[PDB]
Amino acid sequence: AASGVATNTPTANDEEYITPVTIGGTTLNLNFDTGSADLWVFSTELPASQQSGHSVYNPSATGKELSGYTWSISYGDGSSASGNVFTDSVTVGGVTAHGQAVQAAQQISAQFQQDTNNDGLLGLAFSSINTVQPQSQTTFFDTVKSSLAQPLFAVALKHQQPGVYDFGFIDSSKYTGSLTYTGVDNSQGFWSFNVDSYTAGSQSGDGFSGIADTGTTLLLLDDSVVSQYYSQVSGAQQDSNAGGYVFDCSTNLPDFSVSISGYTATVPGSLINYGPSGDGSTCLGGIQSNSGIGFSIFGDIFLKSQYVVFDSDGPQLGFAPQA
Ligand SMILES: COC(=O)[C@@H]1Cc2cccc(c2)CNC(=O)C[C@H](NC(=O)[C@@H](NC(=O)CC(C)C)C(C)C)C(=O)N[C@@H](CC(C)C)P(=O)(O)O1
Ligand SMILES: *[C@H]1O[C@H](CO)[C@@H](O)[C@H](O)[C@@H]1O
Ligand SMILES: *[C@H]1O[C@H](CO)[C@@H](O)[C@H](O)[C@@H]1O
């Protein structure tokens, strides 16, 4: 059976996490994203000026076209990309997917034209939300899962340190105590789960649903919860140059926790200081608004506190404090 360890590394301020992937023999640095289901890459089909600062996929060398097939994706921050489709060999942590659909970019939006830290995305959401047309394709994980020892992957994201994506096995040294599992609702293609209650510092409230999403930097909550949290943070104010609530960098921030099937997942206040906010001398908060969408986004701020098991059997998510 197959298993492997893929090493991730945060960019500055842990904005995103990058992991190397070898496609047709070329290694690209990709953003592993449990919130989407497309494996797309910078390619030789982009204008030459947009290739600069990247490693790029050359489909002509090793790929097999899917004639007539295309892809086009849009993300929550308004970024987007599109192109055509080839199958090729894709290796992650020593585990090879043969005949994996690789979505070669022809068009990329401004955000991607400005980010030279990644060479594309590797989606790890359910394959039902893959965007390839006219027929959807499987994620790397779904392609390999029946070859793995167990049909799961697990994630340790860290603050300013390398972390892991474990494929096909659980590393019990990555967490304290035992895992607690909760049921996943895959009806919208996400790793969605329920929380029974939350604690924002000195205030608590009722539960809600949200998605485990490695591709979102922050912990995005309802505006009522965000307001409750920052009401406890002296001097907090919104700054649209920075991206939301900011505060003095020396602030002692309250913890934030959720109740997940009887387990308390706690984000220490230290992790809620995202980093310097950008002009001047404040720090951006790691908790921000979810734009009124009606569910929460358990992004990297939250995930840095946990080891998280994404198990296709169920499906289900397992949580324990990171170690
Ligand atoms: C339709 O599904 C998506 O777009 C999914 C899931 C989702 C759903 C609802 C709301 C969000 C996220 C909530 N998330 C968002 O609205 C924004 C999110 N982008 C970010 O976090 C961006 N982060 C920053 O700009 C740093 C700032 C916030 C200090 C991005 C550069 C990593 C984002 O769109 N992430 C997608 C990947 C990214 C590389 C573009 P993801 O695939 O994780 O988003
Ligand atoms: C992941 O698990 C497989 C299956 O036991 C091993 O072969 C591999 O070395 C890694 O520990
Ligand atoms: C990624 O790299 C880290 C070491 O940098 C390993 O521990 C891991 O197994 C993988 O090679």
Distance between the termini: 27 Å
Number of strands: 24
What is the CATH topology assignment of the largest domain? Answer: Cathepsin D, subunit A, domain 1
- Assembly context of the chains: monomer
The distinct bound ligands, ions and cofactors come out as: the ligand COC(=O)[C@@H]1Cc2cccc(c2)CNC(=O)C[C@H](NC(=O)[C@@H](NC(=O)CC(C)C)C(C)C)C(=O)N[C@@H](CC(C)C)P(=O)(O)O1, alpha-D-mannopyranose
Number of folding domains?
Answer: 2
Biggest sheet: strand arrangement: 18-17-12-13-22-14-21
Please tell me how large the radius of gyration is. 20 Å
Q: Helix count? A: 6
Glycosylation sites: 3, 7
InterPro entries: Aspartic_peptidase_A1, Aspartic_peptidase_AS, Aspergillopepsin-like_cat_dom, PEPTIDASE_A1, Peptidase_aspartic_dom_sf
Active site: 33, 213
Disulfide bonds: 249-283
How is this structure best summarized?
Its EC number is 3.4.23.20. By secondary structure, the protein is mainly beta.
Structural features, described:
This protein is mainly beta and 323 residues long. The protein folds into two domains: 6-170, Cathepsin D, subunit A, domain 1 (Beta Barrel), CATH 2.40.70.10; 171-322, Cathepsin D, subunit A, domain 1 (Beta Barrel), CATH 2.40.70.10. The chain is 9% helix and 45% strand. It has six helices and 24 strands. It has helices at residues 48-51, 59-62, 110-113, 140-144, 223-230, 300-303, and strands at 4-10, 17-23, 26-33, 39-41, 64-74, 80-92, 95-108, 120-123, 152-156, 163-167, 180-183, 192-200, 203-212, 219-221, 237-239, 244-247, 256-260, 263-267, 273-276, 283-285, 287-289, 296-298, 306-311, 316-321. A seven-stranded mixed sheet has the order 18-17-12-13-22-14-21. The longest helix is centred in the C-terminal third of the chain and has 8 residues, at 223-230. The protein is globular and about 60 Å long. The two termini are 27 Å apart. The chain binds the ligand COC(=O)[C@@H]1Cc2cccc(c2)CNC(=O)C[C@H](NC(=O)[C@@H](NC(=O)CC(C)C)C(C)C)C(=O)N[C@@H](CC(C)C)P(=O)(O)O1 and alpha-D-mannopyranose (MAN) (2 copies). One alpha-D-mannopyranose binds at residues 1, 3, 149, 168-169. Its main location: secreted. The active site is at residues 33, 213. Keywords: Aspartyl protease, Disulfide bond, Glycoprotein, Hydrolase, Protease, Secreted. It comes from Penicillium janthinellum (Penicillium vitale). Glycans are attached at residues 3, 7.
